[PDB]
Structures are given as C-alpha cells and as structure tokens.
Amino acid sequence: FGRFTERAQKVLALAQEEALRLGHNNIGTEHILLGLVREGEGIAAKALQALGLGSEKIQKEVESLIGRGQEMSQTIHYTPRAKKVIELSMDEARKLGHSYVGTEHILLGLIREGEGVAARVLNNLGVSLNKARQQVLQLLGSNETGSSAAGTNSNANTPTLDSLARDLTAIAKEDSLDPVIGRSKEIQRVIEVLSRRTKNNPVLIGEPGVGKTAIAEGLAQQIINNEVPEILRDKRVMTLDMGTVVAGTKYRGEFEDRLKKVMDEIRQAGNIILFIDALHTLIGAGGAEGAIDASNILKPSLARGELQCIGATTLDEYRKYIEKDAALERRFQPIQVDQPSVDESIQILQGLRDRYEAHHRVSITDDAIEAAVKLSDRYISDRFLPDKAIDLIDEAGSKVRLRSFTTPPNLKELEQKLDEVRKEKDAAVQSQEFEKAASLRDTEQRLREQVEDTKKSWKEKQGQENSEVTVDDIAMVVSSWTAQTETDKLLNMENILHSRVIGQDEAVVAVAKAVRRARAGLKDPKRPIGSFIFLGPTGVGKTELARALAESIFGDEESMIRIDMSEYMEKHSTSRLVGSPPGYVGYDEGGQLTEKVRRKPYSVVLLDEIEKAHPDVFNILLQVLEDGRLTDSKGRTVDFRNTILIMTSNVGASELKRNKYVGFNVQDETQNHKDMKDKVMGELKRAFRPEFINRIDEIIVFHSLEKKHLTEIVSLMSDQLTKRLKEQDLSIELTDAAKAKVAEEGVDLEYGARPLRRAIQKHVEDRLSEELLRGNIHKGQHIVLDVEDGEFVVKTTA
Amino acid sequence: QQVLQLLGSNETGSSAAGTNSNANTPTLDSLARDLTAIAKEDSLDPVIGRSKEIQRVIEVLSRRTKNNPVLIGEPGVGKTAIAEGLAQQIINNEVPEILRDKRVMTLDMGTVVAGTKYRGEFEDRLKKVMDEIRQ
Amino acid sequence: QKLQFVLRFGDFEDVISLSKLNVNGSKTTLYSFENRYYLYVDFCNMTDEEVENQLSILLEYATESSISIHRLEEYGKLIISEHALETIKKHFAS
C-alpha cells in the first residue's frame, strides 16, 4: 500500500525480532501476535494487555509453538500466514476510512486470520480471538481530529428534524465545519432576499457546475450570528434532503406524503430556512414530460413565507418558475451565481487533491491543476469550467499511475521467467523427478527475489506519480478523450492542422490563429473558441479543416457537430428528412443544433452551405456566434461557448472546382492556381448576407480542385480504405507510387476524379486481399503498397 | 446418508480462512455475487477479450471526477468479458494505490426483478443500493 | 483430534521452506494438484500439545486445505511421496 501509521509498522518489525529470539526463523502469525504485544501498550499491544496478555506471555507461547532453537537467522522474513494478517489489517483501516493503517487494525487483521499460529497463541493464553479484535477497535480506529462536546437545546424542533434531515448549522458547532470555498459574494445577497416576510425566498442561478453547495455553508454561519434581522434571530437551516424522501418511499403517493409531512411541520415559518437543491423537480412546470407536482402545496407556502426557502437552480431552470408568476415570483427573486471565472475553478481543484492522492497521483503538479482550469475553458469545453477541470486532473491523476506498475526497469522479463520455472518444476515433480523439480524450485525462488527487488525498484514510479498529476499528463488526458500537450496542441495547432489539410494554406493559418488566440485560455467562453466561415464550394478542403481542428484544437479527432442550412429552406431535405411546409427551422433551433452541442459543447459546429438558407436563419445562428448560447428545446441552454462555429458557403465553384491542366499552355496549371487563390476571397460575400459573417473570428478561404487535387483525392480515399481494414488487424501503408497506378484509371476528363475510389478498390483493397489470401503478406505485418516500374507491387515488412 | 456425506471436496486450487471488515454487510448481500470472489478461490475466468479495452478503464476509474468508465460497442462484442478482466487485476496487482483495495460488485438485473411487484418496488431496490453506496 | 491433515501450501516453495524448519514426526506426501501444492502431513503418534506445536510450523507456510485427502490421493499427484518434507530437505535444500 504505502501510507501507514508508526504503531502498525513498529508492531510488524517486532515479529522479526522475535523470529530469532524464539528460534522461529520464519515469522508466522505467532510472531505477528507477539509483535502486537511487543509494541507494549500501543493500541494493538494495549488491547492484548486488556484480555490478559503481556509481551512476555506471548513470546513464550510463541516459542512453545515452533520451539527454540531452530535459528540461524535463516532469511527471517514473513511467511504466507503472517502475510494474510497484513492484507486484512489494511482493510480493517480502509473500513474506518483510514488511508493509513495503525496498530488497532493490525490486531484487527490478526484476529481475522484467526487460524494459524497467532490464533493458537491467543487461544492458548486464555484470550478469545474476537475478544481481542473488539478490544483494539474500541480503543482507537482511524486517526482524525476536529470534535467538540457539551450543550443541548430546544423542544419545538422535535417533529421536523427527525424525518428528514440533518441540520446544516449543527456540524459547524460540532467542529466538523467545511467552508466550502465559493462564490462568497453570492452569500451576502441571500439575506436581503431571505429576511423578508413577503418575497422571502432566494433563488440562486448559475450552472451545476459552479459547486452551488459551497455557497450554502456560508448561510449556516450567518444564520447563527447575526447578520439576519433582530426577531429574525433564532433561525434554523434545515435542508430538504431528497435522499431521505426517497428512502422508505416506493410510490408517487408516498413521495407526496413525505412532502406533506415536511409542509405540516413548516409552521416554524418566517424564521425557518428550508434549503431545496435542484428546485425544478418539485414545481413540475414546463416541458412535454413534466416532473411530480409538489407545486400545489409549495405555491401558497412560498407566497406565505411558511416555506421561506432557498432555491438552487442552474442556467436553464429559471424559465419554469417565472412562468408561474407570482407565487413563485412573489416568492422568488434572483441572484447571480457565476458561469465560473477561471480562478474559482483553481481553488476547487487544489481542494480535491489529497483524495485523488487516493488514486495516488494528484496532489500536485501545480501547473497541471492550472492546466485543468486554463485548458478547460477552451480544451474540454464540454461541461462548465470546474467539472471539465477536475476530470482532466484525475484522468491524468491515474493515467500515469497506470503507466507506473507496467514493468520493473525492463526486468519484466524476470516475471515472465519465474512463471516458466513453476511449469517445468511442477510437471517434473508430477512425474517425480523429485530433484528434477527441486533445482527448478530453487531457480524459481531465486528469480522471485530478483523480480520483487526490481519491481519495488519501481517504487520510483510511485515517487513519480504519488504527488504529481503531470502538466503534460493533464493536458494529454484532455487530448485523449476529445499545460503541456494541450498548450503544445494550441501553440502548434497550425502544425497539426497542416498535416491533415493539403492545399488551402490560406484557410489553415486563418483558423489556427483565431482559435489559438481564444484557445490560449485567455478568452472567456461566452462565444465560440473560433467562429468561422469556410469558403469555397463543396470539395475544396473546408470540412477537412474542421476535422483537423478537432484533432489540433481539441487534441483528438472527436467532437464535431454538423447542421445543414440547406434543410432550412425546405428544398434540399424536405423529402429526405421528415416534415411538411411548417417544419424545418423548428427542428433545428428547437432540437437538432442545440441538443447536439449540449452533448459535446466542444464541437466544431459546421452550419453548411449558408447561401441556401435565407438570411433569417442566420440571425438565430448569430446569437450562437456572439453570445455562445441559444435557449431552445423546452428552455434548455446550450453552451456554444466552447464550440467552434464554422459556417460553410456556396462560393466560387467554377474555378474552385476547375483543375490545372493545359488549356493553352503549361501555364494553364499556374493559372488554375493563382486564379483559385483569388476566386474564394471575392465569392464569399456573394454567398451570404453580411449580418451573419461579421461575428466570425477570421474569414477562412479554401481554394479549388487543381490537378494536383486529383492525386490528393486518391490519398484521401486510399487512407480511409486501409484504416477501416485496420480493425481486422491489417497494418497497411500506401506509397505515393501506388496511388499513381490507381490514378491511371481515373484521369478521365469525362468522369472526373470519381473513378479513383473504384481504382483504389481494384489496386489496394482487392490487391491486399489477393495477397493476404495467398499468404504472401499477413495481418499484423506492415504492408507497403508501391508501384515498381509501372505496375503495382505489394511488399511486406514487420 | 453415508455415501452422500463423503462425496469428497474437490477444489480448483482454492484457499480460505477468515474475512475482513464490518461495513460490507448491508450492501454485498442483496444483490449480488462479486467478480472478485471467484478469483480469490481460483475459479477465475479466462476471460478472452477485448484486452486493450481493459487498460483504458483504469484511467477513467482511478478518477474521482470522470470516475465512471463507459464501454461503447455491439452487444454482442462479449463486452462482459472485459469486466472480469478488471476483477482479477484489481486484486493482484497492477492498479493504483487505492485500486488495490477496490472491490467490484455487479448490479444484477435478475436480483432486482426477483421479488418485485411493480416499477415502484424496482425503484425501492435501487434506492436501497444508493443508501449503502457509501462504500 | 487431528493427526493427519491436508494442508495447502501456497506453492511447492512453501513446502520446502517448511521442510527447512522442524517438521519432524511427519510422514508426509506432497501433492501438486491444480498446480497448488497440498502437503499431506500424516503425524504418526503426537499428543494435542505436540500437534498444536507442529501444525503451527506447517501453518506458518500453509493454511489447512479444504481439499479432502482422498482427493489428493486420487485427483492429485505426488511430488515427493515418502516423508515429503524430509525428502525435500535432501533434494531442495542448499
């Protein structure tokens, strides 16, 4: 394990001491027991001293069970009995929440292993084994502090507090207080809104997702002394805990009955504070599938102030309360809880370190915690600023902890061997062939010590991680799903985007710089990390950059939404997607676009071919580009604050699909180039209204379909083929030469660049399969596809 | 009688003696047998994976943040094979420091349906699990 | 009480270790069965005190197998028959 208390460790070594002192050169449980009592009067030792066992009494018994002498100090270590007692003790401290293991637990574990020599020692010296395990437990368990005693009060409190529930005020007078770090400025604003008797109900709106609950412990403190008014003193804060309500309930009627009981006791009115977390569920308002309607009792209660309560709500929730104005608006009144500022994130992260140090990585590295924050606003980008954060931390706060125990130095070969020994040995004795197992046995246990010696030399991988979450690591984990390898991803985004988009350097650099500015963790998420228009017609490199943006920008290929503007005109998907004349935009705003981005807020959102849609759609979208939010889909709020908005457009097609070739000269090629590098940048404005486009962070231009583009199309198709074949376990690569023979059947002037897929099928798929079937090449072998002197040739390598 | 009572105890490499900890009682009873158990008596499964799947779980599981791993793939894969993988390694011994003392307990649908009479009763069983989930 | 036991030793190596420590008074036959080594001690003439002693020693390295002795003799196989521990001291001790 690692991380134990003194008393424990001390009890353990004393066994070995007695090993030799009593002649039992192997420390069985008799010596562990002895160890407990030989630590004198520690919790183990002391326990044994209660039941009637001196250090003396044990070692003599111990000595009477393996005899004396048989010593020579022949490698006096534990044996498996003694090892069992230890395995148990660790859990006997885990049980008590200890991330350490002390004396008590060692006797507790000893008892657990209540057969073997220890067991016989205690049962011979007039001590019942469980009487001993009792005794240790009831002295001390886990080590902790923060406690106080003396004091009682109140009578009226009786009916309420039984039910349902713990009283927040209590635990902070018990010296079990936790701050909890908010979101401090929120707490002050509650008491104006609370110590009323007319609209006395606060309602906190933020995100889930801010750690709302942090603000709440604030209240506790102020409710005691003295901020709340003079005869509004003697306030108590009772939380209406959902967990207690569901407990003992198994029906809708029963759930209502529990709420009724709370309401009946609520007669403590106007001087009682009820805390309702996630307020919406009880009101049941809004939606097409509302929640249980507590609202009938709650509405007059809220208005009366008998239910003088505090509501904890989020981004979306509020709409469904102001709709039932005013008795949840003659009660309600709002106060601002953050869309978390970066700094608030950091302190939460730091706070939860020691328990990811139970996953034993984090605590630390500092920059890496910071990485969780800084990286989260732009890179994942999938929740709210602290939820995101902590995930980056702990993922990496385990990732390396996984990398930890993979090998000894490289002495993984030792373990492999030690296995092989057993086999030889075993089967040889199974014939017997006594000594024909023997030397193999001897070789085995030799091996074993080497194995274990260099695997606990890979305690260096513990000291590596067991306080470190790595900079690069936190970032790496953020890159993995969807500091260093996110900020290297950020800084070098352009480098990453160039390796997957061939041509359209114009486009790449434009996205790169706009995203990288935002993406440096220096732009608030409340607008896409990049808004963009991706110009050129379909087939010019637009989408491919969006994809490449997911890889570079997000650190993995994952997360890309994609919405068609052409459907929001009912004439390109009015009969390819279900609906009628009064549909299509209602599907997009009302459902598709907003729902999709709620799943991954990260996503490169591609609202394609924006010319086709009328400009009116663009106004709706415009709110996405500016605000970073839309509220649609039954009042849900979708964070496009983390998205990259990419609007593609119907731009310039004729040149921007024109190929090089010789049209008049060998300078018709260099006139497809210069011409395409002109044609995007004037065609863009014609493909849309300006109102959409200005709220876009750089206007990305993608140019033509050169000749030159043909051999780039072959290299897009062949790579998609060979990769879907990788799941089989085929490792394939195409040389440029092999893409050339494929081009031989697709330099058609009359059928374009379409035949290339078919010719890839013929020359790659079909050819690889015709080489695998013959056993010329194999799966797992790396397969190079080349053309030799004009004819394609398939070669194999490792 | 006489024959029955000397069938003979055939193990499979089994070992036994005592059990630790007290808190474990309410939870593990219900609902359900533990993957961990059969591998602590040498009755463990092959399991044949989907091997590269098992490793990626331990990142996502030695989290306490995005603490929940989530396997996506066909029914049908034999996804369930990957799970017994974890069991075996969480015992001995390539896992993080507290993931050597983790336990794997299965939420078995069969125990939940057994003894039920309505949807409400099914929910009651899930509620009971949540109270005990304090482990 | 108990004077013949089927003990499971964690592996063969446990049996060896044990042999290298007082295990006198034990005719013993050592099985490997399910790759685990059971060591079948057959104490010929010990009293309660003498077994509580001896059996300790064994059980520093062993646990007491749940596998029946007729299971070893049948569905297991001998590793060192004889006085297995004793024999092991010959051919396995350094």
Technique that determined the structure: cryo-EM
Query: Rounded distance, CA A224 to CA A169, Å?
Result: 7
**CB–CB contact C60 A26 (8 Å):** yes
Residue with tokens 């885990």: A94
**CB–CB contact C13 A74 (8 Å):** no
Give the chain A residue whose CA is nearest to the CA of C13: A441
B80 is in an annotated binding site: yes
Query: Rounded distance, CA A482 to CA A561, Å?
Result: 13
Contact A631, A651 (CB under 8 A): no
Cis peptide before A165 (omega within 30 of 0): yes
> Going edge to edge, which strands form the sheet with A604-608?
A563-564, A604-608, A644-648, A530-535, A699-701
Query: Rounded distance, CA A675 to CA A669, Å?
Result: 10
Question: Quick one: tokens of A750?
Answer: 């009359």
Pair type for strands A604-608 and C4-9: unpaired
Q: Which amino acid is at A106?
A: I
Which residues, at least 6 apart from A749, have a Cβ–Cβ distance to it below 8 Å? none
CB atoms within 10 A of CB A129: 23
CB atoms within 10 A of CB B126: 12
Contact A785, A768 (CB under 8 A): yes
Residue with tokens 């069992």: A84
Q: How would you write A583-630 as a 3-class SS string?
A: CCHHHHHHHHHHHHHHHCCCCEEEEECCCCCCCHHHHHHHHHHHCCEE
Query: Rounded distance, CA A205 to CA A201, Å?
Result: 13
Residues constituting chain B: 135
**CA geometry: angle A645, A650, A656, nearest 5 deg:** 115
Question: Quick one: tokens of A738?
Answer: 């092999």
Residue with tokens 């104005």: A325
Query: Rounded distance, CA A613 to CA A135, Å?
Result: 79
**CB–CB contact B60 A398 (8 Å):** yes
Residue A750: Cβ-neighbour burial (10 angstroms; 0-12, 13-18, 19+): exposed
Query: Rounded distance, CA A614 to CA A609, Å?
Result: 11
Residue with tokens 């919790």: A43
Chains touching chain C through at least 3 C-beta pairs below 8 angstroms are: A, B
CA A190 centroid distance within chain: 33
CA-based torsion, A537, A538, A540, A541: positive or negative: positive
Residue with tokens 């001196």: A54
- DSSP 3-state percent helix, strand, coil across chain A (nearest 5): 50, 10, 40
What stretch of H or E contains A507? helix A505-518
Give the chain C residue whose CA is nearest to the CA of B6: C68
Q: Nearest CA of chain A to the CA of C70: how many Å? A: 17
Contact A639, A340 (CB under 8 A): no
Q: Nearest CA of chain B to the CA of C62: how many Å? A: 10
Query: Rounded distance, CA A538 to CA A726, Å?
Result: 29
**CB–CB contact C14 A80 (8 Å):** yes
Alpha-carbon distances, residue B75 vs A726, A729, B71, B78, B79 (angstroms): 21, 21, 11, 7, 7
Q: Which amino acid is at A234?
A: D
Q: Nearest CA of chain B to the CA of A462: how many Å? A: 9
> Dihedral angle at the C-alpha atoms of A583, A588, A592, A593, nearest 10 degrees?
180
What stretch of H or E contains A272? strand A272-277
CA C22 centroid distance within chain: 12
CB atoms within 10 A of CB A636: 16
Backbone dihedral region for residue A665 (phi beyond 0: left; psi -120 to 50: alpha; all else: beta): beta
Contact A702, A542 (CB under 8 A): yes
Contact A307, A341 (CB under 8 A): no
- What DSSP letter does each residue of A220-249 carry, written as one string? HHHHHSSSS-TTS-S-EEEE--HHHHHTT-
